[PDB]
């Protein structure tokens, strides 16, 4: 749900 890394599931990122 954040920015760093591909994505957590919905947001443009994971971390």
Instruction: Write the DSSP assignment of 1-15 as a string of letters.
Output: --SSSS-SSSSS---
For the beta carbon of residue 7, count every other beta carbon within 10 angstroms.
Answer: 13
Distance CA(15)–CA(9), nearest Å, equals 11
Question: What is the CA 10 to chain-centroid distance, rounded?
Answer: 7
Q: Say which residue the tokens 């760093």 belong to.
A: 4
Tell me, rounded to whole angstroms, the distance of Cα 12 from its chain centroid.
5
Cα 3 from Cα 10, distance rounded (Å)? 10
Experimental method: NMR
Token representation of residue 4: 């760093």
Residue with tokens 């591909």: 6
Alpha-carbon distance 1 to 4, whole Å?
9
Query: Rounded distance, CA 3 to CA 9, Å?
Result: 11
């Amino acid at each position: 749900l954040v920015a760093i890394v591909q994505a957590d599931w919905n947001a443009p990122g994971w971390f």
